[PDB]
């Protein structure tokens, strides 16, 4: 659930890095054309090859200031790539969501809400068990307006993403989960 290029980096940051390398190319060029004792084309090729790690171009700065500036630019490219990889790994390892409601005492299920629906089988033991409990009166009043006819329709409607939770016995639910590897209790 991520984007290819512009997910870990901002487009304005891309433009800033581009302008930075474009300026650094001219700055490396001038340091040789204005010093005593640099093929602007080859200088720009070197400046682009150091950042993109491509093994293209055969040129090296012959000065000292240009040399230390190239070393600093190489370090900058290295730390930029390292930060990019770190942010990408962090965003790719911290993007695995799974609700997996714990059970009856789950906060989402303990209190009624419009963002979570659940039903049961009307005129059954579950209705008596919910009507006899006073702690779950709100949950019973909420589920009363969603009761289904039988399990045959309820199980079919659950997979249709029409519902979000369904309650039944252990044996029937376990058999429906085992004989149809689509839902898991």
């Amino acid at each position: 659930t991520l984007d290819s290029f512009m997910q870990p980096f901002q487009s304005t940051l891309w433009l800033l890095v581009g302008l930075s390398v474009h300026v650094v190319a001219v700055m490396l060029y001038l340091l040789d054309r204005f010093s005593p004792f640099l093929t602007l084309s080859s200088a720009m090729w070197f400046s682009w090859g150091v950042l993109l790690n491509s093994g293209i171009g055969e040129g090296a700065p012959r000065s000292f200031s240009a040399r230390i500036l190239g070393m600093v630019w190489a370090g900058f490219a290295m730390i930029i790539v390292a930060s990019y990889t770190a942010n990408l790994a962090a965003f790719l390892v911290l993007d695995r969501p799974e609700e997996r409601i714990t059970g009856i005492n789950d906060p989402r299920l303990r209190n009624p809400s419009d963002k979570f629906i659940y039903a049961t089988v009307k005129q059954s033991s579950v209705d008596i068990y919910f009507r006899r409990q006073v702690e779950l009166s709100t949950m019973y009043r909420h589920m009363e307006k969603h009761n289904y006819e039988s399990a045959a329709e309820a199980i079919q409607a659950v997979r249709d993403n029409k519902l979000h939770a369904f309650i039944w016995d252990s044996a029937v639910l376990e058999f429906e989960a085992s004989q149809k590897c689509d839902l898991v209790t």
């Binding site: 340091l31 055969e58 090296a60 230390i68 900058f76 390292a82 990889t85 911290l94 963002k115």
Partner: protein
């Protein structure tokens, strides 16, 4: 060469002609690979543990006392014709004169305004705000903690003047605290679900202000490059 071998092997180099020097630079390249691997591992581990950065002092902060002598003016207010409004008017005249512009119309209206970003803060009663924060959709809202609270008081039970029954009900309320039933009532009716919600880490997306460090490093490096160029020119001119 020995410097380029540590930054992934990006700049061209000039390899020697010997064999022991080759073994030495190979050992150095292995060391640089280990160094880079450890650096990348620690950097990836670092970005996954940043969260929970928000705090205010109280009613004596510079944000409340000096709204204009700071960043663009902060906002905070509440509804008029209330006990809190009367108290803040009798206590902080200038604060009330400033906040009179942001007077809201209710509690849910102020909550929606804060959720939409139209208002920056909210000053109201502690109990109702704590309830509406602990029993709200999501856990994005939270108070500034108990800390220091001006005009700290409680909700009593009014009784007719000179009534002897007061002595009995006082001991009754004290026994309620001593037995722990009051804590159970507060946890059942007042304490919400967000009270036990831990911090949730997220991704900052690496905005521009984050790379300000390396940008200033590159700027200082360019400045030092110019300084060294001037110095070398001066030293070689004579």
């Amino acid at each position: 060469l020995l410097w380029g071998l540590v930054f992934n092997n990006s700049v061209p180099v000039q390899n020697p002609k010997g064999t022991t020097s080759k073994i030495m630079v190979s050992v150095w390249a292995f060391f640089a690979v280990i160094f880079l691997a450890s650096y990348t591992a620690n950097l990836a581990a670092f970005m996954i543990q940043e969260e929970y950065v928000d705090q205010v002092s109280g009613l004596s902060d510079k944000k409340f006392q000096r709204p204009n002598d700071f960043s663009p003016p902060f906002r905070f207010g509440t509804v008029p014709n209330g006990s809190t409004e009367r108290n803040i008017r009798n206590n902080y005249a200038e604060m009330h004169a400033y906040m009179g512009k942001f007077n809201q119309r209710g509690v849910d209206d102020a909550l929606l305004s804060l959720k939409t970003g139209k208002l920056d803060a909210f000053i109201y009663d502690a109990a109702v705000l704590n309830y509406m924060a602990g029993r709200d959709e999501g856990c994005k809202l939270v108070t500034i903690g108990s800390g220091k609270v001006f005009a700290s008081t409680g909700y009593g039970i009014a009784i007719q003047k000179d009534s002897g029954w007061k002595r009995q009900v006082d001991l009754a309320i004290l026994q309620l605290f001593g037995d722990g039933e009051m804590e159970e009532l507060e946890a059942l009716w007042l304490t919400g679900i967000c009270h036990n919600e831990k911090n949730e880490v997220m991704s900052s997306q690496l905005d521009i202000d984050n790379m300000a460090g390396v940008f200033y490093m590159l700027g200082a490096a360019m400045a030092l490059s110019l300084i060294t160029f001037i110095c070398e020119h001066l030293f070689y001119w004579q």
